[PDB]
Amino acid sequence: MSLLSDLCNLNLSESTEKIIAEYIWIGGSGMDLRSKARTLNAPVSDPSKLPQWNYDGSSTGQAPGEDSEVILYPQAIYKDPFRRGNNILVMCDAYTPGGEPIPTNKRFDAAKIFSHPDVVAEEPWYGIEQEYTLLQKEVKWPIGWPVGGYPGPQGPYYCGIGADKAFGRDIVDAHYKACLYAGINISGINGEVMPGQWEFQVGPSVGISSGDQLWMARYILERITEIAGVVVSFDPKPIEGDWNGAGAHTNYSTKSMRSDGGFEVIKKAIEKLGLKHREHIAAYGEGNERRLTGKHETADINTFLWGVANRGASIRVGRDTEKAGKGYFEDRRPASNMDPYIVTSMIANTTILWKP
Amino acid sequence: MSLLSDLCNLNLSESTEKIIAEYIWIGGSGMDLRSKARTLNAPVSDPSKLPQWNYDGSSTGQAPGEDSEVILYPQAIYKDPFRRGNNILVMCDAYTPGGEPIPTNKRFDAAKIFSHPDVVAEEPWYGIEQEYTLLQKEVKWPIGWPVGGYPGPQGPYYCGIGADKAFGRDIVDAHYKACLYAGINISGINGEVMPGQWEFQVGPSVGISSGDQLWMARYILERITEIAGVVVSFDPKPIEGDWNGAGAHTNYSTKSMRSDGGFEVIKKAIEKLGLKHREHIAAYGEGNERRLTGKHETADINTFLWGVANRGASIRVGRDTEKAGKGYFEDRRPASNMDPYIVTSMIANTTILWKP
Amino acid sequence: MSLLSDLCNLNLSESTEKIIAEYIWIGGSGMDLRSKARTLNAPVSDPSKLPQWNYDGSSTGQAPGEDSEVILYPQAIYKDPFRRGNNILVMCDAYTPGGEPIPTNKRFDAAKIFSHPDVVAEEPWYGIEQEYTLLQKEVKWPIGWPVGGYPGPQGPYYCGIGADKAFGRDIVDAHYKACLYAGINISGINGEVMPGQWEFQVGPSVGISSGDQLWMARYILERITEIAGVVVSFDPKPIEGDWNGAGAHTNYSTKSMRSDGGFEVIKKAIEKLGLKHREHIAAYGEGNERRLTGKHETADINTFLWGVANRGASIRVGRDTEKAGKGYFEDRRPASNMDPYIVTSMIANTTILWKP
Amino acid sequence: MSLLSDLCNLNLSESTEKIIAEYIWIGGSGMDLRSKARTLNAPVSDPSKLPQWNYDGSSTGQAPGEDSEVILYPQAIYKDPFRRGNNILVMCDAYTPGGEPIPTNKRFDAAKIFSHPDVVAEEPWYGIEQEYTLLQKEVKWPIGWPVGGYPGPQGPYYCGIGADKAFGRDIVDAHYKACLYAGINISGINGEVMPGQWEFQVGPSVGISSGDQLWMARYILERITEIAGVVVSFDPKPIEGDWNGAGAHTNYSTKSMRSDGGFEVIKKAIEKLGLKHREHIAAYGEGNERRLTGKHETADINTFLWGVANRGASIRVGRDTEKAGKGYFEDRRPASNMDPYIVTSMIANTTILWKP
Amino acid sequence: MSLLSDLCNLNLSESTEKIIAEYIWIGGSGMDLRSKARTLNAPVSDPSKLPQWNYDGSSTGQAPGEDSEVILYPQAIYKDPFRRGNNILVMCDAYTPGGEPIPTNKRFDAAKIFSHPDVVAEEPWYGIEQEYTLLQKEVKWPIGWPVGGYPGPQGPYYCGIGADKAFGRDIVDAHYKACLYAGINISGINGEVMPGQWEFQVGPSVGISSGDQLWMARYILERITEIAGVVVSFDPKPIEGDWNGAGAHTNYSTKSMRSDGGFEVIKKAIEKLGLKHREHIAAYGEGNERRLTGKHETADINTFLWGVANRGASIRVGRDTEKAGKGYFEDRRPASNMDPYIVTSMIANTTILWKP
């Protein structure tokens, strides 16, 4: 189209020297994201030089009814894909005046854990595999499904090509381009054994940058999906039928594990993480009850078991690590609406800081 | 349109230096193709430097067993038409951990038979004439045909121009441009006697590059018709009533045939191929019995006829070849869903290595 | 639409040196045109340095059922408007193995008669005024025309501007641009009395080349209207009723007539044309029985007339020719589906060779 | 619908005794019909008492320039299916002012022929089998034909049954019941091989009654299909190609042919009919040339063939009729757009008055 | 609408005592029917009193080339549900001119078998159940069937109620009432597991009457669904996949089995049926092998299984029947496209005449 499309893609440095910095903060329910733009004066490149901002804490649902002002802090800056130029995107944190973070921040303790000398001397690496569903505008069925109906049986959809196999690859391709342009270290994408569903894998990020990049990628996906004209649901089981349930896996790797002869280290880490499976399964995301039932390459909710090749194992280890004696292992417990901060912090703490 | 079309065509070489590389492997049923992308780090030009992957063996219906990982070996690299820049497309063949090919690979034997000193001394040339149908998204009739109805009788459609003659020349022209840009040695296109059917002829490739290029061209066509929202079927008889049945032909040549007085060579090779007619029929296509019936310039399923201008002959030789004493002969047996690897290997073996 | 529009418009000179030469030959019924593309290795500029193709002579209906191969010879090369670059369009004439022109060739005798020393010493000039109707895709009424209805009385449409007067000036303007770009020596366009109808004038093309010019212009028009989405019919009476009938006229000129004392020469030529009239009126086109009736500025089938100003005269002379000699005369006998080769050949032959 | 039906079927006899009479006369073309109604004070039963009434002949193209008045002579009385009650349908003949028939009357001569003492003393019987095609309102395709296409080949369409096999049998049933009600001798109905073409047999009414009843049945049919919203065309070849046409089988038999052993009289009658085949065909109606070629169980216009059980013969005699030695025979040559008056009158003239 | 239906339900007997005879005969395929109508002069009740009539067998594809005439023999008189009054539907058998039956008759042999003194002295009754699917008119999916998809898994569809559970039950109910009215012994109806599939039990009629009534019920059903704009296919497996198909259960019981100690007699009859089951399967109908694979409550083609409460056996005997020691048994092996004449006559033959 050409209506309103000339003004949106208008060069910024031609006239003035002003950029705009959209502000992103975690919403009230813990999963929704909110954003509101604000002009700047000079193109900034240091996240510590940005000015703090605020929003109404009683409209979203993060503050009581006596004092709604919620001070925000800027954390990271990423290049704006939807308006290019020198515009930036920032990730912010919700705090109350007086320096106390809101109960629904989840990044204060994450940064506290990851500022420890041990973790900064170990620098763990995390790779997250996110799975999301694309739903229609109104009916709220996945796109491509007939209204009140279902497509053919699953199996000829995984990494499919052509029509009737991939529904809406434009959104995912645009997402890939935008995250490669912004600065997020994305790795690759593929289909999933459910039609409409997809998946993108975030690369080996260090520290809390994993959570930062995952959140920014979720924001980019939501904006691109809004541009297209559909909605995205991150819940673990979008459809209650007999289809794949969305989830997430977390690659784990520290310096000692991938240095030399790390098989014993990964093994001991498996027992360490299995010791406290209770709180870990309780703190990986609401809605995991309908995902982990015993079907569709999933384990059971109240059991812990690990293997080397079985796809039903809650935690598995790549056979390449066994070949070489060093590598990683896959944590297949987290659901598709998890908070990367808490999961990453719990894994790092239970692995490197806990002394039984 | 401008809905996300600006983001898809974004030059990634201006900001970053990384490229992406889609992976293509032969599916489970033998005809389906699957793809999933990844991000490399440097623009590669040697196929031997690429890293290997795997995929879910129990999702494509070729699971070796408990260990579902299916290692993939990159073979050839082609420039990406749908993303331009330094993006590439690669062709991969399936394998199992342990160095053995998957049962539905059919490329291991082809490579091991085309690495023979004799065949590399003779360097056969193959020209493949693939013909496909374009059929609608929903009712599965060919595009242009009325729903539950038929257009005028065949005859005014062959190489037709204008509306009511060519149904979707845009898609085929885009395919031709993309194949010429990628690196495939495509020769030309033309219509066939049916509304919707078409044809593209692949040029004189050498060795297993014939199968590589044919498979990559099929992938490119399928992606393009996915962009256009149309499904493509390669089966020999898309419509069973009266119309022309799709198939394929295989030009063949070696050094002796096109250099010396090779009329005797080509004729004796024709009897050689006629001696092994049984498994050659059995190994050209699933569903070929609906094509070869005795009508529409097709041979029968129980005879082997070769001549000079017999339109129904299973094999014919070029008249310029006979007049000049050197050239090629045309194999009209293969169907439209063939595997180029097996047909190429069988022809080469039966004509240069197999002896009475 | 931005779908598939990026791939179609690509600059192949950026990556390779290959071009695309599309072959055009006169079909079986005499009026249909057929095409199929190929890939030349290097750009060419001499029409005598091209390879010869063939096609299935039994599919079109132009060759017998024994040896369907139909050798084609390239004649002229024109720049491709629909893909630009170094791509070319070639005009080809059919034949049979053995060098014998097909019964429906009609260009062999044209070239033979125009290679005569007298003709090449006289260099006749022909200007052709072709008029065509644009029909809808399905109903087969003209465009901008109610189904089962009529727009209104004629008179406000001739050279009309604005809506309700010109139905599809976009297609004709595109045709004008493409013909000026290709190499055709087109002169001008205008509307015609009945709505939907149009007219373009090919102007002063010397020698046999007039047939090539007009045929390539027809091909360009038909491809352009295929792109638009409507069909075009060249029959003399597209719609039966009280409406203007389509046709054609042929300007004629030779060195003697446009030299000093040319009025006597043109009068002698008109008398000669009147003397040999039966085969002329039987060879100008199939469909004159509905055009030449006696109405709408048209002569009668059973008469021959000449004049300077009468609109119903079968032939006439331009006024400036009468005033100041030189000039030409307009042959108003040919219909709208004529073969230019035979018409120009007989006109030149009757003018310069036959004696009473 | 709910309204415009209560007062369209309202009963008038309950209030008064005024009836409605529709006067029917043939237009100038000779293939369509005209009708207009006139109130009568009291109900009538015999056509003799109905007074004559005039109509404008200028618009019908049957009147001289000065005096444009035409007089009608009521002939037959039939009841009205669209008004019920005592309302009547009456057939009329156009007469010049002065006691002479209109040139396009075609019934005065028939009445003179049939009123001859020998003709009435022979009591002829006539049976006609007319066929028609139901076609749409705008696109002029037959009902059920996919627009811009053709349905399946000949097959389950000749007197077929079921959805997608027989189109619009409700109109045929409506005609059958209405013509049984009105007073028209209808024998039976059955579909035709072309999808959308039907047929109804008119009973063995005697003399001028056969023509009168057939004209009235055609009037009722075209009124019914006007009500339904479908145009009916009785042309012998509504659709040209590989589909059957429409004809009439005028079965002839007088008192002698069904009383004694007329097995040797039927052949004499056939020969008498065939003595003047040329003008006999010429007196049948336009469109006869495109149907009689030999295919679709038809005969040849320029040859006279007679047989026993061959559909290729112009005249055919049933096996039971020839076995019994008495009965009738089938006259297949008359066209479906004939004038029944002329056909029956001239057949009677040939049979009883004309001599070899 | 109100019009075009008032005169489709008129009282023809009000004016004249003419009745309408609907002649019915099987086409050449053996799975569809044909219809023809004619006016009789007086109402009849005895089928033998109805005169013979002929149809053109060339289009039917079951007539000799020289003599296309085919003679019909009325068999059974059933009252009309679409015209009411005294109008009748009659089932007819096609006879060649000469006495010998049509090759595709299947009724003369059945009549000879059933007219044998032993068969009529045993007075068998047959119970036949048939199942069918209600397909759409353009896309060949069932009714209520989400296009481009499938409905929920097999759930509340077997004789279910409510919207979105039972589709198009109005057609089935109208068929039930119409078959009760016409004179066909129909027992009951219920839904089927596949959404849109139904069935109706035909009551225990005698011998040839069972086949005649089944044919007439199929005729009436297809007429009704033609009125409703829905096509009906009695295929053994209309849709391939994880959905149930359609079959035919024949309930056979003669005097001996129904009386006294019939358990041993029915067991002996079952063994007699199983002795030569190969031609039994061969003489039921095409498409049986797709339906008979083992799943969806059926036996295997190559294996003969019998039992009492096992649905996997080709023969099932009710618990009450065996408890009482007398009754019938169910033959699940017939296909949904069977010929009732052949099945009934063959069952009677193998029961009473054919010996081991």
Residue numbers in the entry:
A (entry chain A), B (entry chain G), C (entry chain F), D (entry chain I), E (entry chain B): 1 to 356
Describing publication, verbatim:
In contrast, under the same condition the majority fraction (~82%) of CsGSIb adopts a pentameric configuration, along with a minor fraction (~18%) being decameric. To elucidate the detailed mechanism of how the interactions between two GSII pentameric rings remotely trigger enzymatic activity, we next employed single-particle cryo-EM imaging technique and first determined the structures of GmGSβ2 decamer, as well as that of the CsGSIb that adopts decameric configuration (thereafter named as CsGSIbDec). 3D classifications of 104,717 and 43,876 particles for GmGSβ2 and CsGSIbDec, respectively, revealed that both molecules were arranged in D5 symmetry with two pentameric rings stacked in a head-to-head manner, a strikingly conserved structural feature for type II GS species. Refinement of the GmGSβ2 and CsGSIbDec structures yielded maps with an average resolution of 2.9 Å and 3.3 Å, respectively, with literally identical dimensions of 115 Å x 115 Å x 95 Å. The active sites of GmGSβ2, CsGSIbDec are structurally highly similar to each other, as well as to that of the maize GSII, suggesting the catalysis mechanisms of these plant GSIIs are essentially identical. The overall buried inter-ring surfaces for both GmGSβ2 and CsGSIbDec amount to ~2000 Å2, that is approximately only 400 Å2 per individual monomer–monomer interaction. This highlights the weakness of the inter-ring contacts, characteristic of type II GS. Indeed, in both structures the inter-ring contacts are established by only a limited number of hydrophobic and polar interactions provided by the residues 136–141 and 146–152 segments of each of the intervening subunits, which behave as two gear teeth (thereafter named as tooth-1 and tooth-2, respectively) interlocking the two pentameric rings.
